[PDB]
Design a binder for this molecule. Structure first.
Ligand SMILES: [Fe+3]
Ligand SMILES: [Fe+3]
Ligand SMILES: [Zn+2]
Lengths: 67, 147
């Protein structure tokens, strides 16, 4: 077994953007390793899912994050 | 339009990633991909047409077809606010006791009981000289096991 949890991405506490960084490259708030769900926004201006999620920047996002 | 695509269970996030890179590479009209832990074995793909999704998944391993019809935006809204973040506690994980007299005490998980939904904990506090057993829900993950 090689689960390698440290290699999984963290999620921005403010905007939920996925990244390996301690702080969010988008909004610079702290990230957390405590998140669930995945929304990949490819085209924010055409995605009504992204509109409903309040996401206007393309990228991978957690559905929720806590810390 | 939004469609539900069947996938292997536990591979939803990975297929969503592969879908995302394929969509960008081939310039398909695919606008978002949603993998909810409330929809195990399913990935939701938002696209202009069904043909875009058919093209997207063609020859893709661990994918078994598109669900008939569409998924309306009303069914997706609740998925955007997930509930009950049920962590997966494992042997080797470092945890912290949430409530009670040992609130805030940290421990290594030495054993996990699925049948009873319990975990056995080697506490960092040497004052308690024995591993104690608690329900999973009385504990939160501090750090994941290393392998
Ligand atoms: Fe390893
Ligand atoms: Fe693990
Ligand atoms: Zn952010």
């Amino acid at each position: 077994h090689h689960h390698h949890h440290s290699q999984d991405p963290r999620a921005c506490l403010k905007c939920k953007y996925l990244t390996n960084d301690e702080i969010c490259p988008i909004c610079h708030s702290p990230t957390s390793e405590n998140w669930i769900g995945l929304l990949i926004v490819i085209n924010p201006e055409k995605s009504e899912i992204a509109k409903k999620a309040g996401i206007d920047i393309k990228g991978k996002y957690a559905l929720s994050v806590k810390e | 339009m939004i469609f539900a695509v069947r996938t292997m269970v536990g591979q939803e996030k990975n297929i969503a990633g592969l879908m995302a890179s394929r969509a960008e590479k081939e310039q398909l009209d695919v606008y978002s991909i949603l993998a909810s832990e409330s929809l195990k074995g399913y990935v939701l793909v938002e696209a202009e047409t069904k043909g875009d999704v058919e093209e997207l998944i063609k020859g893709m391993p661990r994918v078994r077809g598109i669900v008939p019809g569409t998924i309306a935006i009303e069914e997706i809204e609740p998925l955007l606010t997930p509930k009950k973040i049920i962590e997966n506690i494992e042997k080797g994980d470092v945890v912290e006791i949430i409530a009670g007299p040992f609130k805030g005490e940290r421990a290594k998980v030495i054993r996990v009981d699925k049948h009873k939904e319990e975990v056995t904990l080697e506490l960092e506090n040497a004052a308690v000289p024995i591993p104690i057993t608690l329900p999973v829900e009385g504990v939160k993950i501090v750090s994941k096991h290393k392998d």
